[PDB]
Ligand binder design. Structure first.
Ligand code: HEM
Length: 293
């Protein structure tokens, strides 16, 4: 038997209210810019949007972005979530300013905000997630391991109802940010421009000379002479012939990657949620640049 989670618009709010939150997040991202050696909080916000959505299970409709359960200790302390506390504390002051927004809507909106402010595509976003109680927090272990191969990646993502194209598009977000030894047992960025959203991950995967090395934590990762790295799960995208075709596609067509990421990422953030027919349409927020702010 599967739960239903129906979206309920937080009371009386409309598009101008959520655009105000987006703007608060965007402004903080622009100011609090020294984090992680001047990478900024953009990438950890996108990670946080993904980890809070990616516990979803299509089979029983548990986990996912709806309940905003990352705020509970079982989930907050998932070893897979190590590092994400920095994104949570970045958002805490925003939530105090806008205490009316649910936790789900805030964690997911922070990811949308960060992608757009890092020059990525527009991501339509829908409000309505409702905080659910502590007993609904998912058990640890639902997020993926990095030391596996293409068959594991494909199987993992079937749980999230993601197909080959969606998975490859979604992994493009590893253009952003980096791995941190003390968080995950891997170290290094995937590329040079790690707080601008581009198709650089696919380019580097195809064009770099990758060498399998062991890092100071005794895990294997692929390293290049440029100073980039790839997780085994990243690198498996060029080992699997179906994945590789899509990697080449996104490497050679920026716009297509942007459109496919937008669709897949929205779906990720909305998995598990039922929207009434009279729910508002998806919002498309303007960036600070578009508002002239
Ligand atoms: C195979 C599945 C995935 C694996 C194994 C994986 C693994 C990792 C790991 C280990 C990190 C580094 C954390 C750290 O130690 O600092 C990371 C970072 C990141 N992941 Fe993935 N990830 C996966 C999928 C995704 C997806 C689908 C997204 C897109 C929403 C995503 C977005 C990110 C981002 C933005 C970071 C950078 C965070 C930061 O820079 O602090 N990842 N990932």
């Amino acid at each position: 038997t599967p739960l239903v989670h129906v979206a309920s618009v937080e009371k009386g709010r409309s598009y101008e209210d959520f655009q105000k939150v987006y703007n608060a997040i965007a402004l903080k991202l622009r100011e609090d810019d020294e984090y992680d050696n001047y990478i900024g909080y953009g990438p950890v916000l996108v990670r946080l949007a993904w980890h809070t959505s990616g516990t979803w299970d299509k089979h029983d409709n548990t986990g996912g972005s709806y309940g905003g359960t990352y705020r509970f200790k079982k989930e907050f302390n998932d070893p897979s979530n190590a590092g994400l506390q920095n994104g949570f504390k970045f958002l805490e002051p925003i939530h105090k300013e806008f205490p009316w927004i649910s936790s789900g809507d805030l964690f997911s909106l922070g990811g949308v905000t960060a992608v757009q402010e890092m020059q990525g595509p527009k991501i339509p976003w829908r409000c309505g997630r409702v905080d659910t109680p502590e007993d609904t927090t998912p058990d640890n272990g639902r997020l993926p391991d990095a030391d596996k191969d293409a068959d594991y990646v494909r199987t993992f993502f079937q749980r999230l109802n993601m197909n080959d194209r969606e998975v490859v598009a979604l992994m493009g977000a590893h253009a952003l940010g980096k791995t941190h030894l003390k968080n995950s047992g891997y170290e290094g960025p995937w590329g040079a421009a790690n707080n601008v959203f581009t198709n650089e991950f696919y380019l580097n995967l195809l064009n770099e000379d990758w060498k399998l090395e062991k890092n100071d934590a005794n895990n294997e990762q692929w390293d290049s002479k440029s100073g980039y790295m790839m997780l085994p799960t990243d690198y498996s995208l060029i080992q699997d012939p179906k994945y590789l075709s899509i990697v080449k596609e996104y490497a050679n067509d920026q716009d297509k990657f942007f459109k496919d990421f937008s669709k897949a990422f929205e779906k990720l953030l909305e998995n598990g949620i039922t929207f009434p027919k009279d729910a508002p349409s998806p919002f498309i927020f303007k960036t600070l640049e578009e508002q002239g702010l």
